Amino acid sequence: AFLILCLLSAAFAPICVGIVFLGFTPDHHCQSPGVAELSQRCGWSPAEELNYTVPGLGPAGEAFLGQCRRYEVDWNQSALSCVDPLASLATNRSHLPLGPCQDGWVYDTPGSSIVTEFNLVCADSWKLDLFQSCLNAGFLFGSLGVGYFADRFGRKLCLLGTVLVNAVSGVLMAFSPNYMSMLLFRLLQGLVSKGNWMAGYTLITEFVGSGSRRTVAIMYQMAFTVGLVALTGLAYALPHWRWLQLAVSLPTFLFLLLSPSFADLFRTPRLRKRTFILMYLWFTDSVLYQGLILHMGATSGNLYLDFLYSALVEIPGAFIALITIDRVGRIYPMAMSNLLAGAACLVMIFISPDLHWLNIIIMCVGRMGITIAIQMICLVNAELYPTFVRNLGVMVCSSLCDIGGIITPFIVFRLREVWQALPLILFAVLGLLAAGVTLLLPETKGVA
Amino acid sequence: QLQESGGGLVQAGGSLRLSCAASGTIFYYEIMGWYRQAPGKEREFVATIDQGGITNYADSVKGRFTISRDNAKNTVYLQMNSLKPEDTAVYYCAVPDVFVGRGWDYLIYWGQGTQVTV
């Protein structure tokens, strides 16, 4: 009954969220051959070795100075005091020549990742964004294509094929020898994943009536949350990415074995002013949600606890949104939730160096504020719009959010090379501008 | 163009039906409802209905009024039975405003109603 739908909804989350755990770009530094023998001969410490050799740029600039440059010093020659060998050769180390990492890099982690496996750092750092770009392109292409298959064959036949293709693609990607095969498998997996999720949700909506639509939507949200919580536990005992990929892919194959028209909304001056605002708000919130998730995943100092806390705090938002239905209007919660997601960004920009106690609270507040705003849009959509919803919604809204999601990773990851806080200003501006447009929704000349 | 019909004069108790008619654009894109005037008093609330089908009722009339929505004749119906002598007023078919106020207190349309007595 509901168990299969809950399992499918839970298993959909890892496909979209596993970028945080699969590639986590641990700390790295340049490798110089011949230093191991000298270090082991007059051994002093295994953690302070880089303080005397590896270049460092504490104040700033460490991206391309301490992680992509090495000292071209003949360490083989036995002329050193094993305390300050560079000082003995010359009192000024600033004028020493530099160079590229001709051999490779050594990383600091007990597990492994894609970045560690393929040495995907330094001048190749832009290559990690392709991982999400290909998935989002597959999401865009699948939405316009899976509709044809359902009409060609049927709703029942397509689900088994999509599930089988997804299950095979997961294992094949787990057994990928080079980078290009990984990208192809990611594209195929994203396409089929969106297709089967769409088909399953449409079938579920067909089976369930509109009397308990709110209840089933809340159940789906909680199923997504609980599926996302259990992913943190699996990654704790399986540090290697191949094992984690196999464990995530296995259970899917395990349980496997005078009419309302779209042209009427753009001729009446009253209805034409509402749909545009609805699309604008949906696109804005869809962009900010993924932006903040990726930003938190790319700079967290404690990944597991922060992920768990955010997932837990995401739950009461749905309850609050359901409670506040019959007491007040619909623009006050929207405006308050949209304003709560900007001031959090402004504060996060200006947080002085402190502990992590404030950061978790502020991130949870922002996540709850974003979560509240999305539910209200869905409730209003269901309340005010005619019988034809499903197809036009899941097509137009998906194609609108996918084009933003294709470009979001490039902006998020490539705007931190000049300043670390630039995407935060963009998020703040988007949040503050999204709150000032909802005030035009009320109709004028309305007297009780 | 909201137009109401129905409403006679029952001797003492009974059942009767009220009907409201829309144009075709109001029917398919927003929320309808029924209000009461209660002459000698202020405006009152009796019921609503929306596209999905979720309905709300007033506290004083819960369990006595039934509202149903048609789809072929572009009309909305109201069913009431087991009346009381205090239930006499004119009934307005109105379109509330959802985004402002509380959700059912601000109006933008009405149809002048019709009178029924008990």
Number of domains in chain A: 3
DSSP string, A380-413: HHHHHS-S--HHHHHHHHHHHHHHHHHHHHHHHH
Specify whether A407 is located in the same domain as A267: yes
Instruction: Specify whether A187 is located in the same domain as A305.
Output: no
Experimental technique, in short, is cryo-EM
Distance from CA of B87 to the nearest CA of A (A): 23
CB contact under 8 A, A383 and B50: yes
Share in percent of chain A as helix, strand, coil (round to 5): 65, 0, 30
Q: Which two three-digit tokens encode residue A121?
A: 């750092």
Nearest C-alpha of chain B: how many angstroms from A339? 18
3-state helix, strand, coil in chain B (%, to 5): 5, 40, 55
**Residue A331 and residue B100: Cβ atoms within 8 Å?**
yes
The verdict on residue A114 lying in a domain is: no
Task: Clarify whether residues A322 and A204 are in a common domain.
Answer: no
Instruction: Indicate if A60 and A20 belong to the same structural domain.
Output: no
Identify the architecture of domain B3-116 in CATH. Answer: Sandwich (2.60)
Rounded to whole angstroms, how far apart are CA atoms A230 and A245? 14
Set of chain A residues whose Cβ sits within 8 Å of the Cβ of B105: 448
B59 touches chain A (CB under 8 A): no
Same domain, A178 and A305: no
Distance in angstroms (rounded) separating the CA atoms of residues A183 and A176: 10
Same domain, A295 and A310: yes
Q: Resolution, rounded to a tenth of an Å?
A: 3.2
Host domain of residue A38: 27-108
Min Cα separation B83/chain A (Å) = 28
Residue in B with minimal Cα distance to A384: B30
Give the minimum alpha-carbon distance from B56 to chain A in angstroms, rounded to a whole number: 10
Helix (H) or strand (E) holding B66: strand B65-69
Range A278-310 burial, b when 16+ CB lie within 10 A, else e: beebbbbbbbbbbbbbbbbbeebeeeeebbebb
Could you tell me if A207 and A273 lie in one domain? Answer: no
Residue for token pair 């919660």: A333
Please tell me the distance in Å from A322's CA to the nearest CA on chain B.
Answer: 14
Report which of A70, A14, A306 is spatially closest to residue A189, judged by C-alpha positions.
A14
Residues in chain B closer than 8 A to A386 (CB atoms): 28-29, 51
| Domain limit, last residue, from A86, A108, A130 | A108
Distance CA B114, CA A372 (A): 42
Partners of A327 on chain B (C-beta within 8 Å) are: 102
The kind and range of the H/E element at B79 are strand B75-81
Same domain for A342 and A208, yes or no, is no
If we measure between CA atoms, which residue out of A44, A46, A36, A32 comes closest to residue A84? Answer: A44
Beta-sheet pairing, B55-57 with A105-107: unpaired
Q: Chain B residue closest to A258 (CA)?
A: B24
**A250 Cβ contact partners less than 8 Å away, ≥ 6 residues apart:** none
Report long-range pairs for A417-422 (Cβ below 8 Å, ≥24 apart). A417/A63, A421/A349
Give me the long-range contacts of A112-119 (CB less than 8 A, separation at least 24): A112/A239, A112/A240, A112/A241, A112/A242, A113/A22, A113/A23, A113/A24, A113/A25, A113/A26, A113/A241, A114/A22, A114/A23, A114/A182, A114/A241, A115/A23, A115/A24, A115/A25, A115/A26, A116/A26, A117/A241, A118/A179
CB A330 within 8 A of CB A321: no
Residues near A447 by Cβ (< 8 Å), separated by ≥ 6? B106, B107
- Using CA atoms, how far apart are residues A260 and A264, in angstroms rounded to an integer? 7
* Cβ–Cβ gap A384/B30 under 8 Å: yes
Which residues partner with B67 through β-bridges? B78
- Are residue A93 and residue A128 in the same domain, yes or no? no
Phi, psi of B20 (to 5 degrees): -125, 145
User: Of A60, A87, A108, at which residue does a domain stop?
Assistant: A108
> CB-CB: which of B30, B51, B53 is closest to A211?
B53
Question: Best interface-test mutation with B: which of A258, A281, A384 has the largest number of B CBs within 10 A?
Answer: A384
- List phi, psi (to 5°) of B75: -135, 155
Q: Which of A204, A234, A257 is the last residue of a domain?
A: A257
Q: Is residue A61 part of a domain?
A: yes
Same domain, A227 and A334: no
Give me the residues of B, 85-114, that contact A with CB < 8 A: 97-103, 105-108
> Nearest CB to A329: which of B30, B54, B100?
B100
d(CA A435, CA A431): 7
B72 touches chain A (CB under 8 A): no
Helix ranges (H only) for B1-118 are 26-29
| Best A443, A444, A445 residue to mutate vs chain B (most B CBs within 10 Å) | A443
| A74 is a domain residue | yes
* Selection from A186, A178, A213 nearest residue A22 by Cα: A186
Same domain, yes or no: A285 and A387: yes
Query: What count of other Cβ atoms lies within 10 Å of the Cβ of residue A361?
Result: 13
Pair B99, A437: CB distance under 8 Å = no
Tell me if A113 is assigned to some domain. Answer: no
Contact (CB, 8 A) for A394 and A200: no
- Tell whether B13 is within 8 A of chain A (Cβ): no
In this structure, are A61 and A189 located in the same domain?
Answer: no
Q: Return the number of other C-beta atoms located less than 10 Å from residue A214's C-beta.
A: 19
Whether B53 contacts chain A with CB within 8 A: yes
Q: Inter-chain contact A442–B103, Cβ cutoff 8 Å?
A: no
Ramachandran region of residue A119, left (φ > 0), alpha (ψ -120 to 50) or beta? left
| A327: helix, strand or coil | coil
Which of B24, B52, B105 lies at the smallest CB-CB distance from A382?
B52
